[PDB]
Design an enzyme around this catalytic site. Sequence first.
Site, short mmCIF file in Angstrom:
data_model
loop_
_atom_site.label_atom_id
_atom_site.label_comp_id
_atom_site.label_asym_id
_atom_site.label_seq_id
_atom_site.Cartn_x
_atom_site.Cartn_y
_atom_site.Cartn_z
N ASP A 136 72.58 -29.33 80.15
CA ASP A 136 74.00 -29.11 80.57
C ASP A 136 74.52 -27.72 80.22
O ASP A 136 75.70 -27.50 80.22
CB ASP A 136 74.94 -30.20 79.97
CG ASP A 136 74.92 -30.28 78.48
OD1 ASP A 136 74.53 -29.31 77.76
OD2 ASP A 136 75.31 -31.35 77.97
N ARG A 141 78.71 -24.10 80.14
CA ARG A 141 78.61 -25.51 79.78
C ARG A 141 79.15 -26.30 80.96
O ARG A 141 80.25 -26.05 81.41
CB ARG A 141 79.39 -25.78 78.52
CG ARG A 141 79.38 -27.23 78.09
CD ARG A 141 78.01 -27.80 77.83
NE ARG A 141 78.14 -29.08 77.07
CZ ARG A 141 78.35 -30.27 77.66
NH1 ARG A 141 78.56 -30.37 78.97
NH2 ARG A 141 78.44 -31.41 76.88
N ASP A 177 77.50 -34.95 79.71
CA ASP A 177 76.73 -34.78 78.45
C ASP A 177 75.31 -35.21 78.70
O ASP A 177 75.02 -36.42 78.97
CB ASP A 177 77.41 -35.53 77.32
CG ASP A 177 76.86 -35.14 75.93
OD1 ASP A 177 76.46 -33.99 75.78
OD2 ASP A 177 76.82 -36.01 75.03
N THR A 178 74.38 -34.25 78.66
CA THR A 178 72.98 -34.51 78.62
C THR A 178 72.58 -34.68 77.14
O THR A 178 73.28 -34.21 76.22
CB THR A 178 72.14 -33.40 79.29
OG1 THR A 178 72.50 -32.11 78.77
CG2 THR A 178 72.37 -33.34 80.79
N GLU A 193 70.52 -33.92 73.76
CA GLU A 193 69.89 -32.69 73.21
C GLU A 193 68.40 -32.77 73.47
O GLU A 193 67.86 -33.88 73.66
CB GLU A 193 70.24 -32.44 71.73
CG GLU A 193 71.77 -32.38 71.43
CD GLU A 193 72.52 -31.18 72.06
OE1 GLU A 193 71.97 -30.05 72.00
OE2 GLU A 193 73.65 -31.35 72.65
N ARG A 213 81.64 -20.42 75.65
CA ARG A 213 80.93 -20.89 76.83
C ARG A 213 81.90 -21.08 77.91
O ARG A 213 82.96 -21.58 77.69
CB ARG A 213 80.14 -22.16 76.62
CG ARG A 213 79.21 -22.12 75.44
CD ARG A 213 78.42 -23.36 75.26
NE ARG A 213 79.30 -24.47 74.94
CZ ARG A 213 78.89 -25.71 74.62
NH1 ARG A 213 77.58 -26.03 74.56
NH2 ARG A 213 79.80 -26.66 74.50
C1 LIG Z 1 82.01 -30.13 78.03
C2 LIG Z 1 83.04 -29.52 77.09
C3 LIG Z 1 82.68 -29.40 75.75
N1 LIG Z 1 83.53 -28.89 74.85
C4 LIG Z 1 83.18 -28.74 73.42
C5 LIG Z 1 83.61 -30.07 72.75
C6 LIG Z 1 82.57 -30.33 71.70
O1 LIG Z 1 82.98 -29.80 70.41
P1 LIG Z 1 82.08 -30.06 69.10
O2 LIG Z 1 80.97 -29.03 69.08
O3 LIG Z 1 83.10 -29.63 68.07
O4 LIG Z 1 81.52 -31.41 69.11
C7 LIG Z 1 81.32 -29.56 72.22
C8 LIG Z 1 80.30 -30.40 72.92
O5 LIG Z 1 79.38 -29.56 73.67
P2 LIG Z 1 77.91 -29.95 73.58
O6 LIG Z 1 77.57 -31.31 74.21
O7 LIG Z 1 77.22 -28.77 74.34
O8 LIG Z 1 77.45 -29.86 72.15
O9 LIG Z 1 81.83 -28.67 73.16
C9 LIG Z 1 84.82 -28.48 75.21
O10 LIG Z 1 85.62 -27.99 74.31
N2 LIG Z 1 85.22 -28.57 76.49
C10 LIG Z 1 84.41 -29.14 77.45
O11 LIG Z 1 84.88 -29.23 78.59
CA LIG Z 2 74.74 -32.05 75.19
#
Ligand SMILES: Cc1cn([C@H]2C[C@H](OP(=O)(O)O)[C@@H](COP(=O)(O)O)O2)c(=O)[nH]c1=O
Ligand SMILES: [Ca+2]
Length: 129
Positions: free
Chosen positions: A15, A29, A34-35, A37, A75
């Site tokens: 993702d 991103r 959510d894919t 890890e 991102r």
């Molecule tokens: C998809 C997305 C993720 N995020 C942030 C929330 C999550 O915070 P935390 O890192 O604090 O958990 C993290 C999840 O992305 P990942 O699934 O890439 O890790 O990215 C956003 O802020 N906005 C979004 O639209």
């Molecule tokens: Ca992910």
Amino acid sequence: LHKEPATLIKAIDGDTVKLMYKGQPMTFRLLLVDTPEFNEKYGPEASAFTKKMDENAKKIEVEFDKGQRTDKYGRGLAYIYADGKMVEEALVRQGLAKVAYVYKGNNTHEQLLRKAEAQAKKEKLNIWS
Ligand SMILES: Cc1cn([C@H]2C[C@H](OP(=O)(O)O)[C@@H](COP(=O)(O)O)O2)c(=O)[nH]c1=O
Ligand SMILES: [Ca+2]
């Protein structure tokens, strides 16, 4: 919402992708999914799916939603299209991503994706198997 060009720089995982956008390298991103890890189950499969989809595409486009365009990590947050096909929808339709991270200002394609998830759920595909 409108699609804008970008070029693949490099695959990252299911993702996330490194794209050149308006001339500048950026990690994107994918909105609304959510894919797993890479170290989690279906992680390698997700990464492969997105890498191939993006690599094979003649044309990558980005589509920002109505809200936040960058997350707390720098991102970019967008929907990504590969030759007009949304990568989210493709991943979700294969059970390789869950609909996720649906925030209020940035949820234009929720229901489309939810519809895809439902069919993956019914086919017991991958994450749903
Ligand atoms: C998809 C997305 C993720 N995020 C942030 C929330 C999550 O915070 P935390 O890192 O604090 O958990 C993290 C999840 O992305 P990942 O699934 O890439 O890790 O990215 C956003 O802020 N906005 C979004 O639209
Ligand atoms: Ca992910």
